[PDB]
Amino acid sequence: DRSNFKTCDESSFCKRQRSIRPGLSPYRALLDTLQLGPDALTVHLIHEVTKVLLVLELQGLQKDMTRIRIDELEPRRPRYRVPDVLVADPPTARLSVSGRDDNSVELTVAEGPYKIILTAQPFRLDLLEDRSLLLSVNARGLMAFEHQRAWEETFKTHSDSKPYGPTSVGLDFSLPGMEHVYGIPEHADSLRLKVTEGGEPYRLYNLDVFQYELNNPMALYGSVPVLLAHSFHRDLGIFWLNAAETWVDISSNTPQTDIRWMSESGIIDVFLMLGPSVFDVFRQYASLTGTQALPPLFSLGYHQSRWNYRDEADVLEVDQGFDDHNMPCDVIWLDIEHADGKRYFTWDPTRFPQPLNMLEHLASKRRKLVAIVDPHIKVDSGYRVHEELRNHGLYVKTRDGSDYEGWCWPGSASYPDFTNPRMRAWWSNMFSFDNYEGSAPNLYVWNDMNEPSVFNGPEVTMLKDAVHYGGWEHRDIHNIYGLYVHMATADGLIQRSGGIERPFVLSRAFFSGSQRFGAVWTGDNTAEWDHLKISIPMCLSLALVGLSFCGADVGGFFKNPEPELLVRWYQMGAYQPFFRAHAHLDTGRREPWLLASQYQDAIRDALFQRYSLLPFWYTLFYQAHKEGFPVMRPLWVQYPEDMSTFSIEDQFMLGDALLIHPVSDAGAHGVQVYLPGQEEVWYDIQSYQKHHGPQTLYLPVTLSSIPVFQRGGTIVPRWMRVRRSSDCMKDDPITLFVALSPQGTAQGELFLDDGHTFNYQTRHEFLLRRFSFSGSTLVSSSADPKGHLETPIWIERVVIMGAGKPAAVVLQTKGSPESRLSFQHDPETSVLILRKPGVSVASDWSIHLR
Amino acid sequence: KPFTCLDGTATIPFDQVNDDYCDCKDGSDEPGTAACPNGSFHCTNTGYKPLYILSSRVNDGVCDCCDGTDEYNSGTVCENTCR
Numbered sequence: 065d066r067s068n069f070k071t072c073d074e075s076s077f078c079k080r081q082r083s084i085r086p087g088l089s090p091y092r093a094l095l096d097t098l099q100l101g102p103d104a105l106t107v108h109l110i111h112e113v114t115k116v117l118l119v120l121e122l123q124g125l126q127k128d129m130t131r132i133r134i135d136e137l138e139p140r141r142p143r144y145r146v147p148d149v150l151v152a153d154p155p156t157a158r159l160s161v162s163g164r165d166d167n168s169v170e171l172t173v174a175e176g177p178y179k180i181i182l183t184a185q186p187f188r189l190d191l192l193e194d195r196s197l198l199l200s201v202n203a204r205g206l207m208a209f210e211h212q213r214a215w216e217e218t219f220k221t222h223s224d225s226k227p228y229g230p231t232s233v234g235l236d237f238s239l240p241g242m243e244h245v246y247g248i249p250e251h252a253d254s255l256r257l258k259v260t261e262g263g264e265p266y267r268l269y270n271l272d273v274f275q276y277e278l279n280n281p282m283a284l285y286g287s288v289p290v291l292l293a294h295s296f297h298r299d300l301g302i303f304w305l306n307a308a309e310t311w312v313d314i315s316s317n318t319p320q321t322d323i324r325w326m327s328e329s330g331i332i333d334v335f336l337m338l339g340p341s342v343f344d345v346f347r348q349y350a351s352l353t354g355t356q357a358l359p360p361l362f363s364l365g366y367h368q369s370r371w372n373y374r375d376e377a378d379v380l381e382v383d384q385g386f387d388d389h390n391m392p393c394d395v396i397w398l399d400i401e402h403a404d405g406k407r408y409f410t411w412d413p414t415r416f417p418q419p420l421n422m423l424e425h426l427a428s429k430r431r432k433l434v435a436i437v438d439p440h441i442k443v444d445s446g447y448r449v450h451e452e453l454r455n456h457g458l459y460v461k462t463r464d465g466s467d468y469e470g471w472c473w474p475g476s477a478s479y480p481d482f483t484n485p486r487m488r489a490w491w492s493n494m495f496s497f498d499n500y501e502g503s504a505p506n507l508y509v510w511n512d513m514n515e516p517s518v519f520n521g522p523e524v525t526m527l528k529d530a531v532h533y534g535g536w537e538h539r540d541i542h543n544i545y546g547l548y549v550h551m552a553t554a555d556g557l558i559q560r561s562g563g564i565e566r567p568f569v570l571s572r573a574f575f576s577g578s579q580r581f582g583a584v585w586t587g588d589n590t591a592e593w594d595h596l597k598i599s600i601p602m603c604l605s606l607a608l609v610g611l612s613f614c615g616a617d618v619g620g621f622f623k624n625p626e627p628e629l630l631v632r633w634y635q636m637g638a639y640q641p642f643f644r645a646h647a648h649l650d651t652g653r654r655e656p657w658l659l660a661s662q663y664q665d666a667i668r669d670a671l672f673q674r675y676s677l678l679p680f681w682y683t684l685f686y687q688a689h690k691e692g693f694p695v696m697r698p699l700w701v702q703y704p705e706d707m708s709t710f711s712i713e714d715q716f717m718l719g720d721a722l723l724i725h726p727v728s729d730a731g732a733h734g735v736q737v738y739l740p741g742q743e744e745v746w747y748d749i750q751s752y753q754k755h756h757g758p759q760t761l762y763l764p765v766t767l768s769s770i771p772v773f774q775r776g777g778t779i780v781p782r783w784m785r786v787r788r789s790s791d792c793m794k795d796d797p798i799t800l801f802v803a804l805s806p807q808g809t810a811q812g813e814l815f816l817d818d819g820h821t822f823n824y825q826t827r828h829e830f831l832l833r834r835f836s837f838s839g840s841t842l843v844s845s846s847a848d849p850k851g852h853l854e855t856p857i858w859i860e861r862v863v864i865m866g867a868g869k870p871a872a873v874v875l876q877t878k879g880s881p882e883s884r885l886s887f888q889h890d891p892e893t894s895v896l897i898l899r900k901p902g903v904s905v906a907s908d909w910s911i912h913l914r
Numbered sequence: 915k916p917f918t919c920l921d922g923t924a925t926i927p928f929d930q931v932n933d934d935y936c937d938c939k940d941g942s943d944e945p946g947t948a949a950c951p952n953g954s955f956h957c958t959n960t961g962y963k964p965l966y967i968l969s970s971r972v973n974d975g976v977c978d979c980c981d982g983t984d985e986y987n988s989g990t991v992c993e994n995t996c997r
């Protein structure tokens with residue numbers, strides 16, 4: 065049923081580019097034209113046959129990166145360069161000519177150890193650290209650059225006028241020593257990317273695929289053109305900064321992997337991130353496109369959603385249902401049936417006549433609401449949004465100059481030009497409490513269908529020859545249309561508060577940089593066991609490329625899950641970053657209390673575990689925000705030298721502290737848990753049993769089981785007092801779970817702030833604590849002195865795994881007399897519980913076991 | 915005199931009753947706080963029916979008793995609505 069979507073052979077530019085096979089490149093560098101500039105090295109390239117002249121701009125960057133840009137020397141019309149994705153102009157490092165011959169120029173970045181060898185004929189680039197070759201560019205001669213000439217293509221019944229002709233660009237990269245590559249979401253495929261030699265390339269083109277299937281390289285809703293390569297010896301990253309339709313070929317050949325990128329228009333613009341460790345690559349990419357926005361705490365709790373809740377009464381019944389069944393929940397979601405006939409920023413006058421009163425009732429429960437706002441605007445002269453956008457000329461246009469009209473949820477609809485900054489400002493202002501009537505501070509937003517989805521359009525999206533701000537074609541900008549929606553919405557939630565409140569926006573489509581604006585989810589999955597399984601590799605591929613705030617619909621969007629599958633999905637979702645249950649219009653109701661008691665109890669247990677880990681989750685997202693480190697991680701990120709982890713996708717880690725292997729098979733009696741690490745120990749957090757690595761442990765499970773292990777040497781903060789929402793909990797005391805290394809040590813961090821504003825940044829109102837255990841002493845100190853916070857949070861309990869019974873326990877706090885703590889000890893489990901230390905979380909203190 | 919958990923599991927000093935730390939497995943040592951997971955808080959609710967609520971709803975910032983006595987140190991001031 066996939067004739068809707070083009071294969072590479074049906075994409076004329078992919079067909080052309082991919083017909084170029086590995087061979088002798090006709091491109092050659094004219095070393096006479098070489099020039100060392102203040103920021104870059106420029107040199108002319110020429111196609112030996114067509115005599116087309118190109119310009120290579122080569123840059124060494126601070127933080128050990130290289131940027132390669134190639135454009136035409138004298139083009140007829142300007143080529144697209146991706147804006148608004150880089151957060152800054154990347155700081156450059158000085159290049160030097162350190163060697164030369166008849167066919168070569170050797171370049172040194174600053175004073176070493178990184179070198180770039182430019183070969184003149186055939187054109188080629190080699191990147192080295194000292195004398196070790198890291199990667200090659202155009203080593204297989206696959207560079208292709210169709211210059212703007214002085215064409216018309218039809219697929220199905222849609223006609224692309226293509227007025228500029230062939231303009232595609234492409235380039236290959238060789239990675240010696242690399243056998244494993246990852247990234248380039250979004251695909252319903254394995255974490256470790258497969259070779260494309262015998263089939264389709266991986267496609268990056270934001271598309272709405274109805275009932276998408278698993279284990280295939282079709283383009284889905286988002287596109288992040290970032291590829292990570294990992295070996296025992298090094299990590300590298302390739303960031304192909306292009307916003308047009310892009311295909312990616314992968315082939316393996318002493319072990320070596322080749323990567324080839326093929327884009328429809330724009331310039332060649334690629335960043336090479338040289339590591340050497342994967343965390344260096346994280347830092348390198350984060351310096352280019354920014355870091356994960358710090359989510360407001362409530363958005364890390366549980367979200368209850370479906371298409372659709374009926375009316376205000378239904379919403380309040382759902383809210384009361386959580387409290388009547390002792391289940392926590394932070395947000396209830398309102399899908400498209402809450403608006404007036406899919407006119408966004410409105411409310412159905414019969415079923416949602418008093419949104420402020422509904423939002424006030426939720427605020428009295430200290431809960432929030434999310435409302436969907438899609439970018440397509442119903443063509444309707446009675447719709448003020450459409451009238452304003454049309455009158456101000458802020459719509460995407462066709463070549464004849466009329467506003468583009470396609471078909472979507474409200475019928476005929478137009479599409480605002482979110483590439484236009486004047487349009488984004490209009491959109492952002494529309495979220496003011498005066499403009500978006502019925503909204504309130506506890507109402508947040510969901511951007512959907514922002515690929516953009518166009519029901520009567522080619523491949524269910526906008527025509528390639530639609531025209532945007534500045535005259536650029538839609539084919540030039542497609543993959544950042546969604547990001548611009550996400551960005552303008554999030555800025556609107558900040559502005560409406562006067563710049564004080566952090567936003568929460570969920571987006572379906574995305575691109576490099578989307579991590580700056582909120583969360584994403586994997587779209588319309590299906591209530592099936594294999595879709596449950598695939599949520600791990602999909603969110604892991606997003607984490608690796610900077611999008612840490614990822615999740616999948618709990619229970620599956622399509623179809624009705626069996627109760628056991630829904631339980632397993634709650635357990636899985638409870639340990640994934642974005643935790644939302646959602647369901648298609650025609651599914652049965654599956655709020656978690658509607659199931660038989662045994663299934664309710666397992667789900668409530670999963671919900672309690674998630675809420676009690678919120679301090680841990682919040683700290684991981686603060687580290688992601690400050691450092692660019694992913695929250696959810698593949699095992700190989702934490703164990704880069706254990707080759708048996710390089711493909712694992714049925715387990716993951718949260719930070720470096722928790723290893724998770726959720727049950728994802730019906731009627732399972734046990735799971736095989738790989739516990740990695742030489743000299744490493746792992747604590748079963750349910751039984752406190754210690755296990756040494758490396759080993760594959762067979763763990764028997766029941767319905768209520770969630771296989772979770774804490775790593776020795778880590779300290780995990782928890783809120784053991786689970787309440788009805790996170791707002792209710794954010795002044796509660798902390799319990800510290802200390803998992804002792806074999807050396808008797810452990811460390812951990814904890815971030816705290818007001819939970820929802822930018823005060824942590826504009827006023828340094830926060831705490832970052834370091835907890836360290838060594839010898840027989842637990843010590844709390846500041847990990848950032850610039851942060852102070854007025855908070856009643858205190859340490860109510862310390863749980864130490866792998867400890868012997870002490871003779872006495874002594875607490876010392878700055879400003880207080882030395883005191884004695886009572887304690888309980890279990891000889892079977894070697895678990896030590898220190899009772900009520902009672903010290904403020906803002907204080908330096910130490911606890912000694914004698 | 916020391917206090918004994920109602921289930922009969924421990925004996926704690928009287929100053930560990932309502933000291934905002936859970937010492938009894940049945941929650942009986944913290945009837946007025948949110949420290950135990952299985953405790954209960956009693957709403958006298960003069961002018962309506964008396965009510966028991968979860969300990970986790972003491973000082974959560976939400977008005978659970980009509981007399982408002984479950985919120986005594988949370989920043990939420992609950993008015994009496996029993997009539």
Ligand SMILES: O=[N+]([O-])c1cc(-c2ncccn2)ccc1NCCCCCCN[C@H]1C[C@](O)(CO)[C@@H](O)[C@H](O)[C@H]1O
Nearest residue numbers: 274370371399400436471512519520587588646647648
């Ligand atoms: O191919 N069709 O069946 C098909 C063809 C046409 C068509 N019409 C005219 C001309 C040509 N074609 C129109 C509609 C459909 N079916 C669409 C239903 C699939 C549901 C997916 C949507 N899920 C989205 C939206 C939402 O459902 C609600 O906002 C959110 O709940 C989800 O989270 C979110 O992802």
Ligand SMILES: [Ca+2]
Nearest residue numbers: 930935937943
């Ligand atoms: Ca007590």
Ligand SMILES: [Ca+2]
Nearest residue numbers: 971976978984
């Ligand atoms: Ca309360």
